[PDB]
Each structure stands twice: as C-alpha cells, then as structure tokens.
Design an enzyme around this catalytic site. Structure first.
Site, PDB file in Angstrom:
ATOM      1  N   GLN A  18      49.822  14.813  81.170  1.00 21.57           N
ATOM      2  CA  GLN A  18      50.726  15.229  82.623  1.00 21.57           C
ATOM      3  C   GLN A  18      49.661  15.162  83.262  1.00 21.57           C
ATOM      4  OE1 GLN A  18      50.742  20.068  81.977  1.00 21.57           O
ATOM      5  NE2 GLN A  18      52.235  19.715  80.513  1.00 21.57           N
ATOM      6  N   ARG A  45      46.549  20.869  73.516  1.00 22.86           N
ATOM      7  CA  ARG A  45      46.608  22.088  73.038  1.00 22.86           C
ATOM      8  C   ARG A  45      46.800  22.409  71.336  1.00 22.86           C
ATOM      9  NH1 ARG A  45      52.815  22.788  76.485  1.00 22.86           N
ATOM     10  NH2 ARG A  45      51.168  22.436  77.917  1.00 22.86           N
ATOM     11  N   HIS A  92      46.911  22.404  80.367  1.00 27.20           N
ATOM     12  CA  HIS A  92      47.983  21.497  81.268  1.00 27.20           C
ATOM     13  C   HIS A  92      47.012  20.789  82.424  1.00 27.20           C
ATOM     14  CE1 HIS A  92      49.060  25.765  82.815  1.00 27.20           C
ATOM     15  NE2 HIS A  92      47.875  26.028  82.989  1.00 27.20           N
ATOM     16  N   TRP A 119      50.877  28.089  76.147  1.00 21.87           N
ATOM     17  CA  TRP A 119      49.436  27.100  75.909  1.00 21.87           C
ATOM     18  C   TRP A 119      49.000  27.902  74.682  1.00 21.87           C
ATOM     19  CZ3 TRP A 119      51.683  29.487  80.464  1.00 21.87           C
ATOM     20  CH2 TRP A 119      52.532  28.864  81.142  1.00 21.87           C
ATOM     21  N   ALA A 150      55.796  22.366  93.123  1.00 17.05           N
ATOM     22  CA  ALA A 150      54.580  21.802  92.328  1.00 17.05           C
ATOM     23  C   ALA A 150      55.613  21.643  91.104  1.00 17.05           C
ATOM     24  CB  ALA A 150      53.193  22.715  91.474  1.00 17.05           C
ATOM     25  N   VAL A 169      54.866  30.061  90.189  1.00 17.65           N
ATOM     26  CA  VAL A 169      56.331  29.434  90.937  1.00 17.65           C
ATOM     27  C   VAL A 169      57.002  30.504  90.899  1.00 17.65           C
ATOM     28  CG1 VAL A 169      55.797  26.735  90.562  1.00 17.65           C
ATOM     29  CG2 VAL A 169      57.240  28.305  88.977  1.00 17.65           C
TER      30      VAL A 169
HETATM   31  N1  LIG Z   1      53.333  19.245  71.648  1.00 13.67           N
HETATM   32  C1  LIG Z   1      53.136  18.230  72.896  1.00 13.67           C
HETATM   33  N2  LIG Z   1      53.150  16.649  72.800  1.00 13.67           N
HETATM   34  C2  LIG Z   1      53.652  16.200  73.720  1.00 13.67           C
HETATM   35  N3  LIG Z   1      53.936  16.695  74.497  1.00 13.67           N
HETATM   36  C3  LIG Z   1      54.844  18.054  74.447  1.00 13.67           C
HETATM   37  C4  LIG Z   1      53.977  18.655  73.894  1.00 13.67           C
HETATM   38  N4  LIG Z   1      53.955  20.498  74.450  1.00 13.67           N
HETATM   39  C5  LIG Z   1      54.318  19.555  75.855  1.00 13.67           C
HETATM   40  N5  LIG Z   1      55.151  18.641  76.077  1.00 13.67           N
HETATM   41  C6  LIG Z   1      55.248  17.953  77.537  1.00 13.67           C
HETATM   42  O1  LIG Z   1      54.813  18.521  78.568  1.00 13.67           O
HETATM   43  C7  LIG Z   1      55.876  19.069  79.399  1.00 13.67           C
HETATM   44  C8  LIG Z   1      55.039  20.628  80.511  1.00 13.67           C
HETATM   45  O2  LIG Z   1      53.980  21.032  79.689  1.00 13.67           O
HETATM   46  P1  LIG Z   1      54.899  22.483  79.516  1.00 13.67           P
HETATM   47  O3  LIG Z   1      53.759  23.517  78.532  1.00 13.67           O
HETATM   48  O4  LIG Z   1      56.028  22.965  79.008  1.00 13.67           O
HETATM   49  O5  LIG Z   1      54.973  23.199  80.899  1.00 13.67           O
HETATM   50  C9  LIG Z   1      53.479  23.572  81.565  1.00 13.67           C
HETATM   51  O6  LIG Z   1      52.164  22.840  80.704  1.00 13.67           O
HETATM   52  C10 LIG Z   1      53.204  23.240  83.387  1.00 13.67           C
HETATM   53  N6  LIG Z   1      51.838  23.897  84.020  1.00 13.67           N
HETATM   54  C11 LIG Z   1      54.529  22.296  84.233  1.00 13.67           C
HETATM   55  C12 LIG Z   1      54.359  22.634  85.780  1.00 13.67           C
HETATM   56  C13 LIG Z   1      54.056  22.298  86.129  1.00 13.67           C
HETATM   57  C14 LIG Z   1      54.011  22.105  87.706  1.00 13.67           C
HETATM   58  C15 LIG Z   1      55.104  23.424  88.382  1.00 13.67           C
HETATM   59  C16 LIG Z   1      56.068  24.137  86.566  1.00 13.67           C
HETATM   60  C17 LIG Z   1      55.230  23.638  85.821  1.00 13.67           C
HETATM   61  C18 LIG Z   1      56.472  18.919  78.751  1.00 13.67           C
HETATM   62  O7  LIG Z   1      58.238  18.263  79.642  1.00 13.67           O
HETATM   63  C19 LIG Z   1      57.206  17.944  77.997  1.00 13.67           C
HETATM   64  O8  LIG Z   1      57.206  16.768  77.721  1.00 13.67           O
END
Ligand SMILES: Nc1ncnc2c1ncn2[C@@H]1O[C@H](COP(=O)(O)OC(=O)[C@@H](N)Cc2ccccc2)[C@@H](O)[C@H]1O
Ligand SMILES: Nc1ncnc2c1ncn2[C@@H]1O[C@H](COP(=O)(O)OC(=O)[C@@H](N)Cc2ccccc2)[C@@H](O)[C@H]1O
Lengths: 266, 266
Positions: A134, A120, A94, A65, A230, A177
């Site tokens: 999200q 981000r 997130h 992140w 989650a 998790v």
């Molecule tokens: N730069 C971006 N632009 C658009 N969508 C994005 C970007 N980075 C990620 N995403 C979206 O964010 C989703 C998840 O974000 P991540 O950073 O990969 O994981 C998370 O943010 C975790 N907090 C998710 C989570 C929650 C609960 C339990 C387990 C995991 C992805 O499936 C994706 O579709």
C-alpha cells in the site's frame, strides 16, 4: 580479424521487481508534490494498527481488516521515539498506523507518503493477495481542506494516465477520517474506472490519540489547531493494470521468466 | 577449504562525476518543489542567448558575458518547435536562453529547472572556468511574486545546509529581470556567505519577445497576464564547497584518482 558478432562475456544483467518500479513511480509522483517517503514496521502493535486509528475491538469496523495475529517472547517492538512499546503484536493490515507513528515523532505542517508491505488473512486468487503493498499519504497543517485531497488525487491521475484522465470521489467509511471517501481514476486506454483507494480528512480522534501519546511521553501537543487529509492506495492492482500483469500471484512467485520481463523499465 | 579472504574477480566498479552528483541533488531539491528539469542546446543563436533576453549588442550589459563566437556552414540549429532558426551562432554564456525556448513551446503556469554546460571566454585559474555548469529556474503564472522567489531560495538553502542556514537578497542588475537580485546562502559549517547566483522577476520585455516569437509562428500569445521569477546559479562552486574540492580545474581534468573519490556518493 575477429567475428565481432559473437556474444561477449556473459556478465550478469540485473533488474528491479515490478512492485519496486510501481512504488518508485508513485513515490516520484508525490515527491513532485512535496511529499517525503518514510517507512514503518511490518510488525505492529494493536494500538497503532487499530486503537490509535479509532478502530476499537469487537466492532464491525475492524472486520474490514482480517488480521494475522502473532505470538512470541523476546521480540522488541520500538515505538516512534525508540521507546519500547507493548501490546498484542500483529502484521499490519495497512500502512495507516504510520500516520500515528509519524505525527508523534514530528510537527506540522508536513507531507509524507508511506509505501509498505501489508498483510491480510484471506484466500489468494488471480486478483487477491494476503501479502501486498500500500502507499499511504498524509498531509497536515492549518487550513488543509478536502479540496486539497481532491487536488492531490487529480494530480495523481494526471501523472499516471495523462490529460484524458479524471478522478471520482464517493462517500465511504473509515474510522480514521471524517469526511470519508473512496476514489477512482478514469483509465482512457482501457476505458474504465479503477478504484484506487480510500482517503478523507484525518479524524478528530486520531489527532487526539497522537497528542495524548505525546503527553504520555513528555512532548507538547502539536495537533490541536490543524487539519489534514490522508489516503491509502493498493500498489499491486495499479501495477497490474499498468504492466499488463494478469495474475497478482506472480509478484511473490519468484519466477525469473516473470521478473526478467521488467528489466527494461530501468 | 578455501581462503575466503582472497580478492575476488576484478569486476569493474563505476562512478558518477561530481558535477552529475551536484546537479542531481540540485534537481532533486527543486523537483520536491514542483520543478521539472528540461535542457537546452549548448550551441545557441545570438537571438536566444542575448536579444530575446533584452541584452542588445554594443551595450555595457553584454560585457557581463564573454562570448565564444562560432563559424561554419551546414550546421542546423533547431528552435523551440523544431523549426530551423538562424542568427550568429555562439556557445551559450548561460542557461537563461532556455527561459525563452521553453516559454514559446509551452503555456503557463509551470515550474522548470534547466541544468547545463555553459561557456565563457576567460582565463582559468583555481577558482574560474571557461567551461562550467549552471542551473536555471523559471516559474511563471498569475500572481507569481518576488516573495515566491525568496521562498524558493530559502527552501534551497534549507535543503542544502540545514536549519541553521539562511539566505540573503541584494539588488543586482540583469537585463532579463525587473526587480533584479543576487542571493547568498549562509553556510554554517564554514561560517560564511557564499554567493550562489542571480535572480529576479522576469522582465516585461522577455515575455514580449516570447509572445512576439509565438505570433511570428502562428501560436496565440500566452504571457500577457502572468508574472514570474527566474534564477541561475553556478554548479561548480557549490560542488566545490560541498565536496571540498580546492581546484575547479579538476572537474574537466579527467584524472581517475580524482573522479574515483566520488563513487561513494552513489
Ligand atoms: N486482497 C487484496 N489484494 C490486493 N489489493 C488489495 C486487497 N485488499 C485491498 N487491496 C487494495 O487496498 C486498497 C485500500 O485498502 P482498504 O483495506 O480497502 O482501505 C485501507 O487499507 C485503508 N487503510 C486506506 C485508507 C487510508 C487513509 C485514509 C482512508 C483510507 C484498495 O484500494 C485495494 O486496491
Ligand atoms: N568563470 C566562472 N567559473 C565558475 N563559475 C562561474 C564563473 N562565472 C560565473 N560563475 C557562476 O555563475 C553564477 C551566475 O552567472 P552570471 O553570469 O553572474 O549571471 C548569469 O549567468 C545569469 N544568466 C543568471 C541569472 C538567471 C536568471 C535571472 C537572473 C540572473 C554565479 O553565481 C557563479 O557562481
């Protein structure tokens, strides 16, 4: 007589932004499953965004992140129970921190879904944004199992793409998790697997940070004998695939010719 | 300068009828429990309204509904699968017939809620109507028990009146249900028990009429190894108690001064 085919008074016709629509459908899908939508603050402390979620500083895990740090005095950040809280301020990377805020302010069992704007620090191209949304999911209570997490995503996929849709679960890592996982849904119409988000069984340490924060606040522990799962999925990508939007930058672009094309989706 | 306190253009401000609001909340409450809203036709045949629901002709049980019989040729009444159906036409005396229409057109398990305008030949006073609305509930599948019916009403009461609310179940008779029951909910604010509606475990014969109609239509039987519960509650009375409406006749009165008072309830 009168030309009844002449345009009438130019009263204005409104519309909802595509993210509002995609968020609404996602929320409706989970509401049907017993989930309730609650929101968190866009400006969070490092404690909720990272520390409470088992993501300590100076460790590889936190690189997942790219944070947007903040500065400025006079700003009051309220915690789960209105109490003023402190800590290095930032823009939530997130929605996950709401998992912690909610649990200190409530008691299991429950089902929540938290939609929200997340931030981000990264370059924006045709399929990437520094600002996006999200949808978090959290279900806690005695006997909650991973079978239930898989059950939820299966229902999500069915509701989103039909009966010819299917879900895929693969091991992946997240400090908050213990089984950890990444899930994809088969999109028949496009004949391909799209990665929707991450999920897993709430980590032992998250429940501990929650009850520790409770104790430090006078509340009795409420998460020693419960489990839960989650998940968190990124709205824009789902919306893009669903509305056929080619450029993710269009969302915050503000161009009326773009926005107007979604009035039909009521 | 300009008098910024002067009334602006008299653009119109709309509103939803109180029954629409009460129906919407009821539907939202059950949607959260997995129920889906489906509607039926206001003009039904005696077969669906009575016969299929184990309510034969010339028997005391049928007196519980004062029917409005109809006459007229050229009218086409469509059945569950678009097939044209026949039979003495009438104005449905309750939503219950949708239990049968739905089950022939679908397969268990499922959860539905059917809101709808119903008609009954009787004098209208301050607390009685010949035209009113009901909300039906039907949940069918293996292992569905009465414990589940009680669970549903408990959730209904909680959602409608808060945590100091409670439900009461007492034996009562309906040809379409074997345990039969009548339920009331405690309304704290008014410190009194209001009778909401009737319910029970779907009668054996209803499932039989359903599968018999299926066979006579080419479809395979789908309800031999399942149980289920159903309920039906009358919207106006709940709305009256909830919006403080003293005269039930106001609903169909059409008076704007009455209707307008509900714009606030979005
Ligand atoms: N730069 C971006 N632009 C658009 N969508 C994005 C970007 N980075 C990620 N995403 C979206 O964010 C989703 C998840 O974000 P991540 O950073 O990969 O994981 C998370 O943010 C975790 N907090 C998710 C989570 C929650 C609960 C339990 C387990 C995991 C992805 O499936 C994706 O579709
Ligand atoms: N004249 C009237 N005006 C306003 N509401 C009425 C009137 N008659 C009845 N109601 C409402 O209609 C509700 C139920 O109608 P009844 O005719 O009593 O039962 C029925 O109509 C059954 N079909 C309900 C049912 C469904 C499924 C299983 C079991 C029972 C009552 O609780 C009441 O609030």
């Amino acid at each position: 007589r009168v030309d009844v085919s002449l345009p009438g008074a130019s009263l204005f016709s409104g519309g909802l932004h595509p993210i509002t629509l995609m968020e609404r459908e996602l929320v409706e899908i989970f509401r049907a499953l017993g989930y309730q939508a609650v929101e968190g603050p866009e400006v969070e402390s490092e404690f909720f965004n990272f520390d409470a979620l088992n993501i300590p500083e100076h460790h590889p895990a936190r690189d997942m992140w790219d944070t947007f740090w903040l500065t400025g005095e006079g700003f009051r950040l309220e915690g789960p129970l209105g109490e003023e809280v402190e800590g290095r301020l930032l823009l939530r990377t997130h929605t996950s921190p709401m998992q912690v805020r909610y649990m200190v302010a409530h008691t299991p069992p429950f089902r929540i879904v938290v939609p929200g704007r997340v931030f981000r620090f990264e370059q924006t191209d045709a399929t990437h944004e520094a600002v996006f949304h999200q949808l978090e999911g959290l279900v806690v209570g005695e006997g909650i199992a991973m079978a239930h997490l898989k059950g939820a995503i299966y229902e999500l996929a069915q509701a989103l793409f039909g009966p010819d849709s299917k879900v895929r679960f693969q091991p992946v890592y997240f400090p908050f998790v213990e089984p950890g996982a990444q899930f994809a849904v088969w999109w028949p119409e496009g004949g391909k697997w799209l990665e929707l988000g991450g999920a897993g069984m709430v980590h032992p340490k998250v429940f501990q940070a929650v009850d520790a924060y409770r104790e430090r606040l006078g509340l009795p522990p409420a998460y020693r004998g419960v489990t839960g799962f989650a998940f968190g999925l990124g709205v824009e990508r789902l919306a893009m695939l669903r509305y056929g939007i080619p450029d993710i930058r269009y969302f915050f672009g503000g161009r009326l010719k773009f926005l107007e094309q979604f009035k039909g989706v009521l």
